């Protein structure tokens, strides 16, 4: 549900599922063009340093 978890897997790993369709890939590139998501990220589980408890 959150774009960070979508970033936690690479976009190619998202392409390895048939739940993504033809327009869905265009939507993926359209959202990822804004440099916010789907740049092939990796975290430990959820939180980086600024995602700290306070």
């Amino acid at each position: 549900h959150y774009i960070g978890d979508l970033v936690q897997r690479t976009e190619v790993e998202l392409l390895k599922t048939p739940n993504l369709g033809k327009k869905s890939l265009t939507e993926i590139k359209d959202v990822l063009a804004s440099r916010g998501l789907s740049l092939g990220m990796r975290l430990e589980n959820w939180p980086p340093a600024s995602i700290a408890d306070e």
């Binding site: 976009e11 190619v12 790993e13 392409l15 390895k16 590139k29 063009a33 789907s38 740049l39 092939g40």
Partner: protein, 330 residues
Amino acid sequence: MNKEILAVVEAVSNEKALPREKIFEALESALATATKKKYEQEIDVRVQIDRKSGDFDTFRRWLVVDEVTQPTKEITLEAARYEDESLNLGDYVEDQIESVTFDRITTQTAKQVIVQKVREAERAMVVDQFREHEGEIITGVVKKVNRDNISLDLGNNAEAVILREDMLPRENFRPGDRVRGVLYSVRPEARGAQLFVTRSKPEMLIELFRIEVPEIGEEVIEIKAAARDPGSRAKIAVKTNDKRIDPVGACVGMRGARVQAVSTELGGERIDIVLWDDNPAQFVINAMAPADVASIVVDEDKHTMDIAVEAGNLAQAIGRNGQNVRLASQ
């Protein structure tokens, strides 16, 4: 199939002998480049052009990669698994299209890019003009005065440049002065290549005296050796091909009016036409002109030679930087 591109291909003033279909494809790529330059998604362009009907279409690309940037033209191999791995790494595989836009801003952008492609075609045809000779003794008239290089205009809109290390040390050129030289290189610079010459070689004076002497063409006399320290001092040894003919008198003209004109080709060369005979002893002794030779020894095994002379002749036979001596040696 509007047939506007049909007659439009056959204009055909400047690009008839130039590639017509390639110019059509280049203009189509310019128009599609402008069509890319109007939207905000930075997608690469491909125009698809028809020869039989004339009409065309505009396709978008998808540009198979292993990377994520240029994201409207970003693909990969795991996404190619849905294409059953048929895509390979690196390709520009197109998988989209576009339609149309009127757009007077983009119309001006198409005009600018078409002027750029027309300039590219002009440069290509000029390089083709250079390809038909590739280097020759040719004259030009310099027009621009740059630093340590002089730009020359020539006929049929072709141009050249003269390098300063290829030029004389003291003789400085100015616009309105013609210079004839042998061009030897066309190095591909940015936005097309330009002709380059070097009007300092002995080839230049050699061809100048060939164009000067009428006995040089007809084999009445043969040019045995042409040696030049360029601009400064030069000595060339020539003989008559068994005609009992004055080679210096025929290659000199009236009162030096060949060679003193030919020196004007070099820009002030101190040139000496010199005699030559049958054996290398008398030929080298007369190629020691202008001087007096008492005797000359040579070694038949190893090509070494020795001469002796008076001091008033030694000053004339030596030279400043060995120009006469190295001239006779080469």
